[PDB]
Amino acid sequence: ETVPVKLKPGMDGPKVKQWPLTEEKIKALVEICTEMEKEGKISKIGPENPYNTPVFAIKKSTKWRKLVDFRELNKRTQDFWEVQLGIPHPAGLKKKKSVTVLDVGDAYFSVPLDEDFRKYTAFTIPSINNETPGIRYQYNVLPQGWKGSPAIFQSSMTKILEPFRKQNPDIVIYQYMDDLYVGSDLEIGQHRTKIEELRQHLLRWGLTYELHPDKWTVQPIVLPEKDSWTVNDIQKLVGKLNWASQIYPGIKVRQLCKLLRGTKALTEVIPLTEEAELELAENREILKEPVHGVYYDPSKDLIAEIQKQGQGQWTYQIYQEPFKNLKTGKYARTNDVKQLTEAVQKITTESIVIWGKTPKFKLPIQKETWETWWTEYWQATWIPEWEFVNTPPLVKLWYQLE
Amino acid sequence: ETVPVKLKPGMDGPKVKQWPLTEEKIKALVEICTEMEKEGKISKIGPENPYNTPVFAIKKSTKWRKLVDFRELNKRTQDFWEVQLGIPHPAGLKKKKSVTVLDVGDAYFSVPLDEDFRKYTAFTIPSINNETPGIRYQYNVLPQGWKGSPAIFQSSMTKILEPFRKQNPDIVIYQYMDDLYVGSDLEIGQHRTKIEELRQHLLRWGLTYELHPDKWTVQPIVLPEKDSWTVNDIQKLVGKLNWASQIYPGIKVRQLCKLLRGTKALTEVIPLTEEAELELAENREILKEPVHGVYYDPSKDLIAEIQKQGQGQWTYQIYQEPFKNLKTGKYARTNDVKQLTEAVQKITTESIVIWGKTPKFKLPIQKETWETWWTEYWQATWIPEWEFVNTPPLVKLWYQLE
Amino acid sequence: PISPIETVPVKLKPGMDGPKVKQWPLTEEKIKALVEICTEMEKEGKISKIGPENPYNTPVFAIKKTKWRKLVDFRELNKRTQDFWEVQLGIPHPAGLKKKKSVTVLDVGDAYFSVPLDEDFRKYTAFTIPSINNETPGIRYQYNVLPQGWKGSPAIFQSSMTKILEPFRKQNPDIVIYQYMDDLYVGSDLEIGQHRTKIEELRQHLLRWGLTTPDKKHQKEPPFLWMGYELHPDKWTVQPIVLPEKDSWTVNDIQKLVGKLNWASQIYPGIKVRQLCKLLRGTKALTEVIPLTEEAELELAENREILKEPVHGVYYDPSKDLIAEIQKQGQGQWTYQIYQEPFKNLKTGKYARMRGAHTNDVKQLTEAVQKITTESIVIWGKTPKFKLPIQKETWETWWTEYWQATWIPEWEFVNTPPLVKLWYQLEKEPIVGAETFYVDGAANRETKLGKAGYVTNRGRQKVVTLTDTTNQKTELQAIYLALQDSGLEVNIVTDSQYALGIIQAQPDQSESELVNQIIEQLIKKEKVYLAWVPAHKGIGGNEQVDKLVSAGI
Amino acid sequence: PISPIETVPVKLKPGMDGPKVKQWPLTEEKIKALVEICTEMEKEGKISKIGPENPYNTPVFAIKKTKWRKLVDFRELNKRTQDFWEVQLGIPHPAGLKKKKSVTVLDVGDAYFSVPLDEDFRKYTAFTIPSINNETPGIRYQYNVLPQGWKGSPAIFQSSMTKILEPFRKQNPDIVIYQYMDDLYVGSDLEIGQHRTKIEELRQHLLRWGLTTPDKKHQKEPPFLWMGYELHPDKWTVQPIVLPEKDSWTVNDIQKLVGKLNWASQIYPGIKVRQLCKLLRGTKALTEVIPLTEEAELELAENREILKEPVHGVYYDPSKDLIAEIQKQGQGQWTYQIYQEPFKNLKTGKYARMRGAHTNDVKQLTEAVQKITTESIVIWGKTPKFKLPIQKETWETWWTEYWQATWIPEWEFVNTPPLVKLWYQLEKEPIVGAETFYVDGAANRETKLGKAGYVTNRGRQKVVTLTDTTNQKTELQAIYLALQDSGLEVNIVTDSQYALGIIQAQPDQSESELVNQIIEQLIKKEKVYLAWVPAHKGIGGNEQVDKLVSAGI
């Protein structure tokens, strides 16, 4: 019994080119796909299918997994999965002491895919040195990575979760793409026991970290505590504070600006005044608490900006309106691309938990470096949207830590 | 007896390419050059001469004349003609009631050119459809168009002018390139008689408009006289006045700015105040007189800017420092290139008379249009330096007339 | 001979119906020629006769040589035909081929005609041979096979040939079958005997599916002259390259020259095209002559020298690793070589790009490494191990301190001058016993006039005026001014994030001559500490230099 | 045979002395080959033996085919040799040749070797055949004739040939002698008899000056296959052009295709390269495949159609005038034809340029006219009379009202759609009964955030926020905002000379999508009156919209 899927009028299916893959990754995919074809999950296709979606091989565990990039198909089917069959996001999930993430993607293999939508799921296995044309396939069942799969499957998911929910009314379960987010206020042993219990319920239907969102405390803009302050240090502080006033309402800086008078050497020691120190502390107390006036608009896209701080640390901010930060934070711990990949997954997970949406990333890296290498370290079953930026020299300074 | 000429060290001779010429102009030049060669003025040259200067044919009279563009060679020999053998410029010339311009270029044919400088005077007669290589030549005598020619010849010119000067001590004679500028305070009949007398002195040595520089009255920035003034008209006036304050010291506009208060319609009539009208008149009285503080620096280049006003009129300003106007004016009276050519010659003549230097022109025309056509209307024996500009939309408005 | 293979179900574009383009009446010679040709095609099963009940039409033309050829204008059918999947991702590269004991070249005979066409689509390929002076109903045909010039032919041919080879590929996994257009390139490591035998089973299997290929006598033998390359039995090269010699080079002569040089750069090391490409800028007419510059003449001469003796490339050995060596050649020019055994090159190449306005050799080298990595994954399915002309210390300093995430896979230093290094470094903190310059620049948006200046803590001051300038140009002037008047140790305070940004990235080359002058000053210095303040917030010396530059703006 | 002509006195570059480049010891086969060759050259008078008293040296190499050839590396001598005058200004164009009853092609034999070399320069051409394993003093020669590969050879040859032809040119003014490299192209309107006679007097006069040319049997006959053209006795064309057909087009395949199309555009009307050139942008590898876009595929198809039947060009008649006809082809694409008698084309061409960011068809047409004028002066020595697709009223409106001086020589209107017209016009004075919008835009230089807005005299207001913007982008946003919310009649007040400038020039096409959106709004309107005020001078509604946009900047 198939659910009919429709694209937005005038919008055609994805025609996205395939990235060159290493021999190892091609072999891994040929073997995976040979088996899915044997099981009737996918079928070899003809040239009459002009559509294409990229395919990659990750590790996620020492076993190769197939990752399909449905980013384009998702944007094109947005109406179906968001308004026609939207999965509501629970506001309580972010409040729980422990959230466990379980992959449920293997559930989609059971449900067949609307015969007229199948062509849009086309993908190619490339060939080294263009020896052969690629191996082409399309899906016969709900695919892993397409937002329409949990949308269709949510009625089947409700039946599976009905007993477990009824017996644990204070346990929040949320489905995002191929994953199940399970939150509780139970002790870590009890929580881990209830997860194992839940896996048993899933096991009867063919379905086979933790995060601590209550412990998610945003990194405030940090102002230094010092004995002696130079001209250079006050200049650095006014710079940092002048910018914070764009975000935080009620930041004063005139008492600090007052100290900087005349053409002076940067190294020269300047003594603190009573009102400058009061201004310094009043701003210090503001940055502690979240920014007043900033609220999530469910109709707007989320954006995430990341800065490289050196020494294995990375800072990030999530907003919908530039500088109107919904969340700020940091990531720590070799390799710049590996570390960046890691931060991207962490920020995305936090956004799925807090708003039920992945953010659009502004990455401080070259398109080509990122495209060649991100798949060597990627472990998530989803892929967020990204773009490449040239980090402003000062934004890094203003978001620094200690 | 040849005067040794030397280029600035590290500076080589001109290697300027020849512009395509029409059949008519090529034939005219072949005939002119065949005769100059017969007279030994120029000689055919070998490939060992890597240098080149453009050649053109003008009318200046219904007889074809050869014009050589020595603009590059002039810049490269600047030391010789400006400091080693400089022709001083008389400040009195601009003060005379009548200035007559006489071509004396034929005097240079008598004096031979330093054998080691000749290679730098190389020029080519092009060939239609590249049938033949060009006809190449270099000068054996002082060439018309090179600033070094009057520099060398000034000792011979002094001997020729000694009797005439001694008999007319109040007549100013100045030599710029191939021309003699002769100024007097005599009545037009007497002046014309003294010019004819002077031509007789020249005639004994083989040498064969008027301008009225006392009548050169700069076009002030004109402010309109009106009964009723709209918002649009005050806005246009503040615009014009705000800019004039950059040039003229002592321009006030706050009384006018005062009238423009609130979000008003442009067509709405606004009544004049006593202080606005006083401000309007005080500025009006300033623009009448020349700008205070602007003086000619003989070490700096002169610049001329020209705007197309439509209906056959053109405005221009001469300065060394932008907006620090030494002279302003207009030219009136078909063809945009012909009219522009005409204005260029008029402004150049005025600058030669006032400062003894041609200005660098900023032309409101496309390089290619100007290059294809300027020779169809050019009548001067010199060529000023030029560049092509995209006239600011407002500069035309601010320099407008009535 | 037309394949018994299951056809490909072709569709027209949604909301579109077939072409109905009127046949233009032709001359008698053209009509006769077309009747001769169409009767023959119809006899061979290529086309079939229809009635006037079919509403579609596509124009037909006949052209001469002294043989007559049928041309079908499929422009309208193509505009109405569905989109198909892209035929090939890229073309095979010789350096990607293994050394095979025996290699057979099998060109398929009349490929498109040997492949059927979807029954329900055939109607839309309707064409009309008109009668003499269009008096009587013209002769009407439709295609049964894939028509030449139709949008779907390349795709459907390739997929049919893929479906056909699929079982043979199972039966012989140790046989290399390269599919390229209407050709098959078959290689194996068997003895001449077992190979000729294996080629015949393939030829026969192909014939069972209505596809004809040449026999041992008509079969091509090495060297293969394929796609601008020479494929010899244990080496490969680009095809003979002749650089013309002219008194006068036109825009067309240089474009052709650059192309041949670029094509030669795949195997001949050190080819340079910078000076020659510089001439093609500010584009003039194709027949217009461009005088060669001394630097272009020197470049042409150096190239002429590389090409005088022939160079070849080696084939790929999957067991041995890939080594990529990069050298800095000059002004943004890079050259590389990929070998497995030194110095027997599989291929060579060049990188001479401008990824921005201001860069350094460290960024350019990283960019070249990325490009070689990508190319290696395409040709061989793996990344090479690099030999780079940069010390590990220079690299580690750069990457740790840079704001952008950057990575070079397994690499090792090689002392091959010119070495890539950073030419200056900004101070991490302000200098004690150094004059503090508070710089600023302001330009009027209307007049385009600007002022650049500084005010120091040592009382010094300066202001210069600029014509046809911008705020960005004045802000860079002010920094340059501060570097010209200061000693070997400066503390500079700007309010420009723009100039700060440029300088902090440690550029050595720029599209701006102002940025180049600044660069020269920075290299001459001993210590430089650049710092930034917000503008118009009444900060120290910055408010003073702000009133100084704002005068007459 | 070496000419008795007076040599050309060659010099070295001031401050420079001759080359002293060491001879590399060669193999025995190379030394023998070179001794064979040099003995023969010396015998013919080409080279002469010297002693070791001469201090200069230039390297020598020998290369094989199975003949041996001598290569001299004159790179160092060339770097030290003086600069010479540029050989040719441009190349002859066939459309520039008159129709001549009889035409003879005379290729000069071993041209450079038939010309002496300055006595005092000969020393600097010194070269050494090394001995076996460089044990004994090598054999040393110097050139007597012009060496191949030397900087001065093309120039000195051409000037010697000019001096040589000079007297014959007087004796026969009605004979056309085209000088091109080491060739002479001789044309006359005499009968086969007097022509063959005249050719012989020239051949003989040439021989008196040691220059050999072919005889009646070795003399080439039309069609001449010269420089990519076919020179027939009463027509000319470009040489056979074959557009390849591929499944996958690489960057190299497209570059070659564009080139052949550009070359074909000299005589085949309506060739288009826009879509094909668009693909070559954002430059990828030469072997990298580029998928053809629908618009590129359509362009390729249209071209394929033009080229199917051969087109020729006609020769020049100096008595008849030149007519140039221009047509607008599309998105900045122009095509032209020059004929004397309609429609027998001397040549064709195209213009598809971007002279700025924002233009209109009136500026593009003026630009095309200038380019054709220039080209005509080069080929024929005169300007053509134009037939333009613009009404005299549209032209007169444009030129009279435009700030830039502009001129089109003798022209006449021709109704050939698409016609060139202005798509909107700004009001000369403010509209009565129209809302006055006071627009403004401000962007923070640090955050790159901006605000675009308006305040009207009807009380209305609006402010939008922009990301990664500039002041110029916000000032154009503010005008667009004002056009989106206003009716068919607006008075707009900006403080931006930049946006004012763009709009006043009446653009119809832009490199900016923002400028294109503005353009669409202006065409929809009935009346628009744009005006300008100085910024930050406290003027009317402008001070109000200034505080509105400055919020959060």
Ligand SMILES: Cn1c(Cn2ccc(C(F)(F)F)c(Oc3cc(Cl)cc(C#N)c3)c2=O)n[nH]c1=O
């Ligand atoms: C020449 N050669 C080689 C190199 N080599 C190795 C394998 C193959 C294989 F059959 F598998 F495709 C070759 O066939 C090709 C491949 C291509 Cl892309 C084009 C052409 C052509 N025309 C022939 C091949 O040329 N090894 N031994 C030997 O003689």
Ligand SMILES: Cn1c(Cn2ccc(C(F)(F)F)c(Oc3cc(Cl)cc(C#N)c3)c2=O)n[nH]c1=O
């Ligand atoms: C072919 N042709 C013509 C056209 N024509 C007219 C005049 C000349 C003239 F002798 F004067 F140079 C020609 O000689 C040329 C000119 C050039 Cl640029 C190249 C070549 C070649 N290879 C031959 C010429 O081709 N007229 N009659 C006739 O048979």
